[PDB]
Structure 1
């Protein structure tokens, strides 16, 4: 019907079910609209700002907002949340200290009039707090862009009060003599956002992000997709547990990721920029509460998959893309081939598996490895016999010798090791199979 309660130019029955914006008006969603590119949106029929961002449901869905905002935030659930963090490009150092900084942005919305805050800490003790004065105020910061932009020298940082920074008493300098870098972390960032007024001009002076930070961060779940070379932070709204009046739609984790990161789902797989980010080909990291929630919710779920559980308010997810991944079907970035591998199989995770008769050993050079970094190998093993014992030997700073008991179906195993020293002993990784085993989706991922 045409009854409207929240007063956001979208009918209630259209909000509860699917709806799309056609020629600046909302129409009932029809499945035949998928081919043309029309996207189906659903949102609560009792609130205008569903995700908490300043733009309402009609403004976000109809594209009537600032053009710098990515298409990911045009979904009423994804919040236009700019994430800004100061990076320390170089250090210059009684003694006067200078630093080179360059702000980074990863959210779905730009931040105007950037004004960050920094902490000068070396070990626990913080020397001083710096609010960037009028010299370092970055006027514009588009998503996935830096201030200054690529191809420009980072701007200096000497303004503390026009007093300059200085470590005094020589005790901090004495501690630094042994070697302790001065960390630069961003406590907070102050910025504005764009709203078109009655006269049509974009006004970005009276606005402020700080009013909506405590609201966006309280009615949404953070989902981060890290590919190593770049990071993307998105927040997806979700309903409360014991609230009988919260009409925020419920979405699965996979659907939340697809909505947030604008992933092209081709049949069954999920792709971000041509790289698969589906459940079986990426290592996910959750905090303790999310891990407990998922563990509790898997038993009640028949399919028993991570990407089929509903999202909940307060969730935290990190999607760590593997550094090196192979599947024996369409991708193998490993510089060195594996040992005793047979592709003549049909019982794999998607198409084929690895038929091993004996043991598999892999040798990796140190050219493509980062010293003082932790790497984790993972894969899926299938053994219908359930009678073969498999052990793995890992050569590293600390020698590891562990055994595994594969099940009838595919099971994911995680083995953690740390490599220290670029010019160290060659890493030896060997796994032994009692009989014939099936392997698929072997991945190498760099961690903290």
Structure 2
């Protein structure tokens, strides 16, 4: 949070003094001019004073400030893309990714509405080849809470340190034909079949 101010000041004083001063004093002299001399002097005085001072002033100032919260020092935005290298398409693609920075995981984000790919056909990407990558922008369920990092991670990030991204799992759907010729992909989840397919297969890449 940066800040900046300007100032301007005017002033006017007016002093009115008044003074009294008595002064009494004795001075004695004794010095042989030719044969002898003596003198005893006494004096009195009284002074009266009046003053009149006027003063004008003109001031200026400018300030600049800079604040920071050390627990939410910066917000992170990742630009990602999905790939399908299998044999079947996946609908409503919902990935879950880790954001890792120097041995610690900053956040685990599941894709909400703004980041879900409706179709993802094999050998294709979301968004498609000619488009720009997504914005993995927020962390909450309603795409309204940005992904924060604290001050030590931000300082570590103004250096050679980078943030990696790891897909821990991906959720999605498959299409079946319902009682009529209509395709349904709503309650048909691929996660019901991942462990079972992996458990009875050999994997060739």
Give yes or no for TM over 0.5: yes
Report the equivalent of 2:3.
Answer: none
- TM-superposed CA distance for 1:174, in Å, is 2.4
2: distance between equivalents of 1:177 and 1:100? 19
Equivalent residues in 2 for 1:139-158 (5 A)? 139-158=118-137
Higher strand content, 1 or 2: 2
**Which residue of the other structure, out of 158, 169, 176, is the alignment partner of 1:177?**
158
- TM-superposed CA distance for 1:214, in Å, is 0.4
* Contact 1:132 1:159 (C-alpha < 8 Å) held by counterparts: no
Equivalent residues in 2 for 1:225-374 (5 A)? none
Report the equivalent of 1:377.
Answer: none
1: distance between equivalents of 2:152 and 2:139? 21
Matched, 1:163 2:145: yes
Report the equivalent of 2:30.
Answer: none
- TM-superposed CA distance for 1:171, in Å, is 1.0
- TM-superposed CA distance for 1:176, in Å, is 2.3
Gaps of 5+ in 1: 1-93, 225-448
* Contact 1:116 1:188 (C-alpha < 8 Å) held by counterparts: yes
Question: Deviations for 1:349-397, whole angstroms, at most 9, x for unmatched residues?
Answer: xxxxxxxxxxxxxxxxxxxxxxxxxxxxxxxxxxxxxxxxxxxxxxxxx
Equivalent residues in 2 for 1:394-433 (5 A)? none
**Which residue of the other structure, out of 177, 190, 201, is the alignment partner of 1:196?**
177
2: distance between equivalents of 1:197 and 1:178? 55
1: distance between equivalents of 2:88 and 2:74? 40
- TM-superposed CA distance for 1:175, in Å, is 2.2
Question: Deviations for 1:178-212, whole angstroms, at most 9, x for unmatched residues?
Answer: 31110111011110001112211111001000000
1: distance between equivalents of 2:79 and 2:145? 17
Report the equivalent of 1:133.
Answer: 112
Report the equivalent of 1:96.
Answer: 75
2: distance between equivalents of 1:191 and 1:101? 17
2: distance between equivalents of 1:203 and 1:112? 10
2: distance between equivalents of 1:116 and 1:189? 4
Gaps of 5+ in 2: 1-72
Equivalent residues in 2 for 1:200-219 (5 A)? 200-219=181-200
What SS does the corresponding residue of 2:132 show, helix, strand or coil? coil
Question: How many corresponding residue pairs?
Answer: 130
- TM-superposed CA distance for 1:120, in Å, is 0.9
What SS does the corresponding residue of 1:100 show, helix, strand or coil? coil
- TM-superposed CA distance for 1:96, in Å, is 1.8
2: distance between equivalents of 1:109 and 1:206? 17
Question: Deviations for 1:33-64, whole angstroms, at most 9, x for unmatched residues?
Answer: xxxxxxxxxxxxxxxxxxxxxxxxxxxxxxxx
What SS does the corresponding residue of 1:135 show, helix, strand or coil? helix
What SS does the corresponding residue of 1:222 show, helix, strand or coil? coil
2: distance between equivalents of 1:160 and 1:173? 18
Question: Structure 1 runs of 4+ off > 6 angstroms?
Answer: none
- TM-superposed CA distance for 1:138, in Å, is 0.4
* TM-score, structure 2 as length reference: 0.61
What SS does the corresponding residue of 2:130 show, helix, strand or coil? coil
Q: Which has the higher contact order (CA 8 A, sep 6+)?
A: 2
Report the equivalent of 1:119.
Answer: 98
Higher helix content, 1 or 2: 1
What SS does the corresponding residue of 2:193 show, helix, strand or coil? helix
* TM-score, structure 1 as length reference: 0.29
- TM-superposed CA distance for 1:128, in Å, is 1.0
